[PDB]
Amino acid sequence: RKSYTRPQFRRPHTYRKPAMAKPSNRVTVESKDIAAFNVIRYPLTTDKAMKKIEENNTLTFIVDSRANKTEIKKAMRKLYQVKAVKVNTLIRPDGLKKAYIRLSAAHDALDTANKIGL
Amino acid sequence: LKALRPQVNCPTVRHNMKRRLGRGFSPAELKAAGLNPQYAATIGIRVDSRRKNKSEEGMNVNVQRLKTYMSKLVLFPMNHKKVQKGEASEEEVKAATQDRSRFGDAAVGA
Amino acid sequence: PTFVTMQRKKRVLQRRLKVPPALNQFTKVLDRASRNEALKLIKKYAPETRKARRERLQKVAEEKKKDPKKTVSTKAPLAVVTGLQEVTRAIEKKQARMVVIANNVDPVELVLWMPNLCRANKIPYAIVKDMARLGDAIGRKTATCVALTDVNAEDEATL
Amino acid sequence: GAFMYLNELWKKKSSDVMRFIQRIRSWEFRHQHTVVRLRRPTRPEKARMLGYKTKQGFCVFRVRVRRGGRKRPVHKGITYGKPKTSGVLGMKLNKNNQAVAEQRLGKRFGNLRVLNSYWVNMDSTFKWYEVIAVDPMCKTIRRDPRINWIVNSVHKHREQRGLTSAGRKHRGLRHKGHKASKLRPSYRAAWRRNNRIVFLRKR
Amino acid sequence: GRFKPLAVKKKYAKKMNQNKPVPYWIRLRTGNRIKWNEKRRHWRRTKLNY
Amino acid sequence: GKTVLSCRKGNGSVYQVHGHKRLGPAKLRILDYAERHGYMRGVVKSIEHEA
Amino acid sequence: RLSGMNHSAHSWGTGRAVARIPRISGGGTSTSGAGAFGNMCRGGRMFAPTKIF
Amino acid sequence: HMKIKDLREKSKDDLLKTLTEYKKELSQLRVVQQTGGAETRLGRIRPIRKSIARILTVLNQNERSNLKMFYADRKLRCKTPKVLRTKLTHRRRLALKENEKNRKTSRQMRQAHKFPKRVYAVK
RNA sequence: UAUUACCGAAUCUUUGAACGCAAACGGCGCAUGGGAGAAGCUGUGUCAUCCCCGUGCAUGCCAUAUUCUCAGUGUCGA
RNA sequence: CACGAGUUGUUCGGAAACUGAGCACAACGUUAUAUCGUUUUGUUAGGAAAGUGAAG
RNA sequence: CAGUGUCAAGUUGGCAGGUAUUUGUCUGCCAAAGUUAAAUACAGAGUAGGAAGACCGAUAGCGAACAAGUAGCGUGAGCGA
RNA sequence: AGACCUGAGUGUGGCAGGACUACCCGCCGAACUUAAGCAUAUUACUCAGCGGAGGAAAAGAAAACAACCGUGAUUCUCUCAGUGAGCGGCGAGCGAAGAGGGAACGAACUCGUUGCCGAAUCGGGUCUUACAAGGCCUUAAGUUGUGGCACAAAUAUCAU
Ligand SMILES: [Mg+2]
Ligand SMILES: [Mg+2]
Ligand SMILES: [Mg+2]
Ligand SMILES: [Mg+2]
Ligand SMILES: [Mg+2]
Ligand SMILES: [Mg+2]
Ligand SMILES: [Mg+2]
Ligand SMILES: [Mg+2]
Ligand SMILES: [Mg+2]
Ligand SMILES: [Mg+2]
Ligand SMILES: [Mg+2]
Ligand SMILES: [Mg+2]
Ligand SMILES: [Mg+2]
Ligand SMILES: [Mg+2]
Ligand SMILES: [Mg+2]
Ligand SMILES: [Mg+2]
Ligand SMILES: [Mg+2]
Ligand SMILES: [Mg+2]
Ligand code: NA
């Protein structure tokens, strides 16, 4: 405000007060213990799926089509006490998302399938 | 159902000889009858401050209309407990009736 | 910025053009010493504030409460007249002993006629430098004009 | 009071001192934007006559419009049809420039209600008006019996529908009686009244 | 060919799911008028052009 | 009639300058204080052709 | 007032071996090219339609 | 089939536990829907879905009532989230209230007091 | 009552005036609250990078600041 | 025609993340009317469009 | 009524009195700021209800008594059983 | 140092843009057609185009009619009247108003200005069961003027 050393005037720097966090506008009760049930829908029992259970230690599921691989892994850990080493996904021509899930060979996919009921 | 209106003469040389009802009473007629215009508006009398009185007979007719009406008014008291000045007693409130004539000329005539 | 440039060029243009007397008279102001003296007098006769008015009225009310009779004398202490409407009325009724006018009112038509009115009624008047200084003297942000109609016995010589 | 002096002074727009003041103001106005917000009216006496008050919910804007006649916007100045409809440069708009200024302000700022306007300055290219508007959500406005009529939704875009003073002027509603019988209560209403065919039940 | 957006793919998937015949028990309902689908679509007769 | 070609060229359209391969405009340097009062010394770095 | 006239029908003209009545536009339906608007056409407007006056 | 009068007595923690149990049941029935299954088993899907709906209804109604009572205090009344106010319509929200209307000037009130409307009759 | 009818309490996916930024992309941000979390640190806890969810964030205009922070060879003044 | 199935990615193509012939939001101007014009010849707007590391 | 030029008077005044001008009378009214129910419209609107007809009777009556603005056509605006 | 004036940045509380558009309000605005041709005229101050409301809208409280024995805000209906009004290549064509009988009607009010007062006003906190038309506090706005009283339906200012 005394001696300017540029050929054009630019806006001076003033004090800015940060905004406040308002009370939330969404007050619907959402349980945090049921999301895995939305993520993992049900298994598949086709011939290819059956062939993968025994020889590749792999299970096949229909999942929510907006889910990603990391959350599918976490949902597997929550719903069944198993550890997935690999998740592969595809979106079918009828619109549903399918997941091929390989277990860590310290668990038996056949025994997990028996417990699931398929 | 209908407020009180004055009698006027029709204009032009074709309707000179006829008579009808006008819009309202002039303040000069109301003063000749002894009435505040603002109070007359509250007891069912129409007031017209535009109209002038250029002759005596037209004014006399309407003053007589106002007096005939005022002699037959039955004013109800504001408070049923206390009756002040010229207000009806309870017998008249019992024997009160409604004039449903098409022109409101039951008690002044045509 | 544009507003800076325009507010300088406006002053230059007001200097270079030919200025008629009715507007030129507002650049010829009272001196420094008399300006300071007059502002001091107005300051000592400033109008009373919100709190002071409330306190005086409450005391008058308690006096009336204790005495339902007797006059109350709700005249308020002597002060200067402030506001364009009231000052114009005082000039026109010749109650004002002296009138002081600010020289920078915008729009200028608000006070452009006041020296002519004071001359017509033979009222002493001056044109001084700041409406902000007048407002400081009377306790507000701004004043366009101020009138003195009467003072105490101790300030007669000063007036 | 002082209103008389201000009004009489503003009745002398062609005197020397008024010409000087208006020249300075015209020069400074023509270096500003088309629409400008002011803190106080330039003519307080006129604004208060037209309904402005020094209260919380009142605002004043200055609007600039361009002078001259309307040009018909046809490609390359070419018209078709009968020769009676062939003028391009010589026809005039049937609205006045004050109504145009009000409409521009109102279309720009949709949260306000336009009350009235007045002439402030003139120049060879431009004319300038000041427009008064109110905020219908201000508590001061909403609780004031003399102004809160404008809160009701039947008054939303008065200026767009031609209901302000300038609009009435170009609708012809300054006149009554035998000088305005074909335009009351509006031109279209009178036309409908005089042109609809009537069928009584027994005829 | 290989490329299409996911929204286009989902529209084609819905049409594939819709292209079906009427289940037989529907014809046994009280007051039924449906006989054939009448909105069946064949890929070589009418084009969707998504 | 229809529009003549000389008038059509004023719309711009497909008759504007083919400038994609051109270098910038060619100018002298700005008339500043050094040029008004003293002198400046530059070095020629390259000579080129433009379409 | 609109019955029988809700089409953008035009006559095909002379030089084709068909009557000069106006005909429905478009294609892909059994109504395309059919007669229209006349009191003698199926789906046309009646002669002297009735009014409430 | 959960009973509504039974649900209205439970607390939040217990209601959430019931919700988890019923979600697990429905998930297990989906597997049966995939792998053949008996008609008696498939008949259980609808009652369980309706029970889940009932539990979420009770939870949400309790929560909204509690928040409304909490914001009913005068200090907080101005900061109520917009989803917890009355809806009405846009126009009615913006319109003049009865108290704001009906306001009158001193002269209007005084004149209404000096000349009130009377009740009369004509004989 | 998986019965009907009505209604006050609720739920209400992706969008669209569509308004954080984009878009033949179920894409990418900044603040601020949460969740899960092998690794490491200590079977509990605790948790970097990665991942998930809620809320706010367009432009313009009006009002306002427990009286917020500034700018002008505009007018003064100490 | 009916029933039942099939498309698996740290590294492949795209996006995340370039610039071209070009487009046109903001800003400003114009029009009774924005649904109009300008917007890369280093470049918006009479034009105050920068919100940061570092020290402490 | 609109554009531009020109631009008042001071209730001794101003405006209107259906043929222009100048000069005297006479009559009505007081522009250039604002609000306001009812009686009137609904000539291709809508919500919640009602009452009818010297009307049409499946090529008629709405395009549509039926999963009808549907199937189908056109790059598209649109067309349309 | 500060102050006022004129402009900015950010926080807090709000509002506008879209849809519908039968009727209604404001602009903009044709030609086919008729004149046995056609250019003024007509179609028509209509269709198409742009903008804006409501349950109706618009209008409305005399700078109005008349020329009488005078009427008396607006709107609407019959009639005035296809007119011994008037406009018009005085052709084709076009074309209203006052009065009279009625529908409705508790229908009337507010600013500015003048005179007398002069912050008595507004917002914001806080307390009374209360975001009171109430108390208390507030420089925040406001004297470049908020508000009160009187003025043709009036008789005058205060005074409890
Ligand atoms: Mg009429
Ligand atoms: Mg393709
Ligand atoms: Mg070029
Ligand atoms: Mg038919
Ligand atoms: Mg968006
Ligand atoms: Mg097939
Ligand atoms: Mg993949
Ligand atoms: Mg480029
Ligand atoms: Mg750019
Ligand atoms: Mg009005
Ligand atoms: Mg049919
Ligand atoms: Mg709109
Ligand atoms: Mg025709
Ligand atoms: Mg012919
Ligand atoms: Mg005509
Ligand atoms: Mg139209
Ligand atoms: Mg209205
Ligand atoms: Mg006042
Ligand atoms: Na002809």
Our CA dihedral for C28, C32, C33, C37, rounded to 10 degrees, sits at: 90
- Residue B76 · residue B82 · CB < 8 Å: no
Cα distance between residue C46 and residue C33, in whole Å: 20
- Residue D10 · residue D45 · CB < 8 Å: yes
Residue A70: enclosing H or E segment and its boundaries? helix A69-79
Cα distance between residue B25 and residue B52, in whole Å: 10
Specify the 3-state DSSP secondary structure of D3.
Answer: helix
Number of cross-chain residue pairs from B and H with Cβ atoms under 8 Å apart: 40
Cα distance between residue C18 and residue C14, in whole Å: 9
Q: Which residues contact H121 (CB under 8 A, 6 or more apart)?
A: B73, B74, B76, B88, B92, B96, B97, B98
Q: Strands B73-75 and C125-128, how do they pair?
A: unpaired
Nucleotides of K under 7 A from a protein CB: 1-5, 7-10, 16-18, 28-29, 31-36, 43-44, 59-63, 66-67, 69, 71-74, 78-81
Residue type, F48: E
> C152 is written with which tokens?
């105490």
CA D36-D41-D47 angle, to 5 degrees, is: 120
Q: How far is Cα of residue H62 from the mean position of the Cα atoms in its chain?
A: 9
CA of D81 to the centre of ligand 14 (A): 20
Cα distance between residue H116 and residue B75, in whole Å: 13
Q: Which residues contact C39 (CB under 8 A, 6 or more apart)?
A: C128, C133, C134, C137
Cα distance between residue D20 and residue B43, in whole Å: 63
- The interaxial angle of helices A47-56 and A109-116, nearest 10 deg, is 130
CA atoms in the 13 A half-sphere facing the CB of A86: 9
Strands, E assignment, A13-110 = 40-43, 58-63, 84-91, 97-103
User: Which of chain D's residues have a Cβ under 8 Å away from the Cβ of C13?
Assistant: 24, 27
DSSP line for chain H: ---HHHHTTS-HHHHHHHHHHHHHHHHHHHHHHHS---HHHHTTHHHHHHHHHHHHHHHHHHHHHHHHHHHTSTTTGGG--GGGS----HHHHHSPPTTTTT---HHHHHHHHHS----EEE-
Cα distance between residue D71 and residue D91, in whole Å: 7
Q: Strands D35-38 and C125-128, how do they pair?
A: unpaired
Taking CA–CA distances from H71, the nearest residue in chain A reads A23
Establish whether the linkage from the previous residue to C107 is cis, with ω within 30° of 0: yes
Backbone phi, then psi, for H72, in 5-degree steps? Answer: -65, -15
Closest CA to A104 of A68, A71, A73: A73
Nucleotides of L under 7 A from a protein CB: 3-17, 24-32, 39-42, 45-46, 51-55, 57-60, 62-78, 95-103, 105-120, 122-124, 126, 130-131, 133, 137-139, 141-150, 152-154
Closest CA to E20 of E4, E3, E34: E34
Q: Strands B7-9 and A84-91, how do they pair?
A: unpaired
Q: Which residues contact B6 (CB under 8 A, 6 or more apart)?
A: B21, B22, B24, B25, B26, B29, B46, B48, B62, B65
> What is the distance in angstroms measured between the alpha-carbon CA of E42 and the sugar C1' of K53?
50
User: Which of chain A's residues have a Cβ under 8 Å away from the Cβ of H75?
Assistant: none
Cα distance between residue H15 and residue H19, in whole Å: 6
Cα distance between residue G38 and residue D141, in whole Å: 64
Q: What is the DSSP letter of C125?
A: E
Beta bridge partners of C133: none
Resolution limit, Å: 2.5
Residue with tokens 């846009």: H90
Establish whether the linkage from the previous residue to D136 is cis, with ω within 30° of 0: no
Q: How far is Cα of residue C127 from the mean position of the Cα atoms in its chain?
A: 11
D162: left (phi over 0), alpha (psi -120 to 50) or beta: left
CA of F16 to the centre of ligand 3 (A): 6
> B80 is written with which tokens?
């049923």
CB contact under 8 A, D5 and C113: yes
Residue with tokens 């008690």: B107
Cα distance between residue D62 and residue D33, in whole Å: 9
- Per this entry, what is the length of chain D? 203
> D76 is written with which tokens?
């390359």
Taking CA–CA distances from A97, the nearest residue in chain E reads E10
Backbone phi, then psi, for D63, in 5-degree steps? Answer: -125, 140
> B89 is written with which tokens?
């007693």
DSSP line for D67-100: -SPPPP--GGG---S-GGG--SSS---SS-HHHH
Residue type, C14: Q
Residue type, B74: V
Go through H16-47 and write b for each residue having 16 or more CB atoms within 10 A of its CB, e for each that does not: bebbeebbeeebebeebeeeeeeeeeeeeeee
Cα distance between residue H116 and residue H111, in whole Å: 8
Specify the 3-state DSSP secondary structure of D188.
Answer: helix
Cα distance between residue B4 and residue A23, in whole Å: 65
**Is C142 (CB) below 7 Å from strand L?**
yes
Cα distance between residue A71 and residue D48, in whole Å: 69
**What does R_g of chain G's alpha carbons equal in angstroms?**
13
Residue with tokens 């277990």: A103
Which ligand approaches the C-alpha of residue D194 most closely? Answer: 1
SS3 content of chain D, % helix, strand, coil (to 5): 40, 15, 40
> What is the distance in angstroms measured between the alpha-carbon CA of B46 and the sugar C1' of L80?
30
**Is A12 (CB) below 7 Å from strand I?**
yes
Cα distance between residue C69 and residue C74, in whole Å: 15
Burial (Cβ within 10 Å: 0-12, 13-18, ≥19) of residue C51: exposed
Q: What is the largest CA-CA distance in chain C?
A: 69
Cα distance between residue H52 and residue B93, in whole Å: 69
C151: left (phi over 0), alpha (psi -120 to 50) or beta: beta
